Curated annotation (Swiss-Prot), chains A, H:
<protein>
    <recommendedName>
        <fullName>Membrane-associated protein Vipp1</fullName>
    </recommendedName>
</protein>
<comment type="similarity">
    <text>Belongs to the PspA/Vipp/IM30 family.</text>
</comment>
<comment type="function">
    <text>Required for thylakoid formation.</text>
</comment>
From Swiss-Prot, chain D:
<comment type="similarity">
    <text>Belongs to the PspA/Vipp/IM30 family.</text>
</comment>
<comment type="function">
    <text>Required for thylakoid formation.</text>
</comment>
<protein>
    <recommendedName>
        <fullName>Membrane-associated protein Vipp1</fullName>
    </recommendedName>
</protein>
């Protein structure tokens, strides 16, 4: 009875952490895409812009 | 206290330096690695617990 | 080369005109609308080359 | 020193870099709307003439 | 925090140098070969448990 | 080791050529529709005309 | 060589032309499209070779 | 009974493993093909691109 | 401020020198190269974005 | 700006020296040979995907 | 060379005017204002160019 009560508590917390890590890894990918896009956008706007020498 | 404040300024400068040295691409990915490396270890503890319950 | 570019773009505009009318006949409004936008875009490119020529 | 704090710090950085690129474009001389609206109106009347005939 | 951030930057940079140097087609090929080796080992293991069942 | 990273390298390398897919997508769809559609009609009218 | 490729496709076009008319001489419905499509593709290729030639 | 249900579960794991590896092999080869297609496209973009040697 | 003005004169002279050293034929073409080299990189970012959307 | 302009002049001149030294007929010939090699590699790749389909 | 830029700023001004009109004909009171302002700037420039010419 003690084992079952405790091992179930641990499963809820593991499940929450699994939701949490997977949230970060899917965000990691799309954020890297967003970052690369932003970097590239800035470089092209500066280069094709007539400002500066 | 001027000593501590000097130390604060030095730590702040070093903190800013290592923040500036970050590249989001590498670091964001590295952070995820750490999350997965930590999760594996917790899974192994839960693995043991389930076996003991059985 | 400018003469060739002009003619080629005009020909592409006509191909997309045909596609628009065929899409319209099939009953798909959206492809007809987009194809007419493509037709206009290629006409505009040809126009630019016309002036340049 | 936690993984999540590192993740949030880089996330905010990336979002700022997106915003910076956006702002840079607006300051440079935005041009991704004034043309779209024209194309839209022009293709609009083109669609009407095509549908009519 | 200073050295914890430093560690994250260093590991991120080292892993990027590894990512750069390797060619993922050769690694993917090698990986499929290794998965096929493991598959054969599991087939043998399965045969052994079937043999004991019999 | 990632099959996905192998895909991403390919996705990158096969992109400069400009593959937004505004062109190809539209084109093929309508083409196959009216193309094979016209082939059916033609074939069936020839089968019931030329005899 | 361009002449030869053009001619080869003309011959191949007749090979699929007879099969298309054959299905249509039996009052079949769903065979003709296959042979007709093949003939159509070959005559488009021959057209390109004609221009080239 | 214990050996049969054990072996059955292990056999199920073997089947799943083999199916996933078969998938991986299929995907690996189509990626090789798309990579080689991209390389070919690049060489045409080079030779038949802009100006140079 | 005479120091800064001396520096201005020197930079102006060097700017004029490197402008005079340009040959339109080479430089105009080189500029286009830079445009295409930049565009390739942006295409690769958009390539990733499209894949992520899918 | 001074050194940015300098870089553009230097790269333009270096590329012109390369353009001068090479003979585009030999390069065009070599290029067609390389395109033909790539074509064969794609043919083999196509055969492999057909084989897997089959 | 001065005459050239003069005559070209004139055409750009006419383009911006036409865009302002077209925007006002579609119910957009924001783009037309900026377009009129850009035309005014370019017409000032044309005036100065005319004087110096
Ligand atoms: N004068 C030139 N015009 C076009 N391309 C050039 C020229 N000189 C060299 N190149 C090469 O051709 C490629 C053209 O870039 P690319 O992005 O493929 O063109 P586009 O942007 O028109 O698709 C570059 O990678 C460059 O190395």
């Amino acid at each position: 009875a003690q084992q079952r009560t405790m091992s179930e508590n641990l499963r809820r917390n593991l499940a929450a952490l699994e939701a949490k890590i997977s949230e970060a890894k899917t965000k990691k990918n799309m954020l890297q895409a967003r970052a690369k896009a932003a970097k590239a956008n800035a470089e092209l706007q500066q280069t094709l812009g007539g400002l500066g020498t | 206290a001027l000593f501590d404040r000097l130390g604060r300024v030095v730590r702040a400068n070093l903190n800013d330096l290592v923040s500036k040295a970050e590249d989001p691409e590498k670091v964001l990915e590295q952070a995820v690695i750490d999350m997965q490396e930590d999760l594996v270890q917790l899974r192994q503890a839960v693995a043991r617990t389930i076996a003991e319950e059985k | 080369r400018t003469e060739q570019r002009l003619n080629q773009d005009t020909q592409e505009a006509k191909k997309w005109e045909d596609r628009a009318k065929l899409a319209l006949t099939n009953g798909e409004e959206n492809l007809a609308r987009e194809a007419l936008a493509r037709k206009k875009s290629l006409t505009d490119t040809a126009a630019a080359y016309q002036t340049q020529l | 020193s936690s993984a999540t704090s590192a993740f949030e710090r880089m996330e905010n950085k990336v979002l700022d870099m997106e915003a910076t690129s956006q702002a840079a474009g607006e300051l440079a001389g935005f041009g991704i709307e004034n043309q779209f609206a024209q194309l839209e109106a022009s293709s609009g009347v083109e669609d009407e003439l095509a549908a009519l005939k």
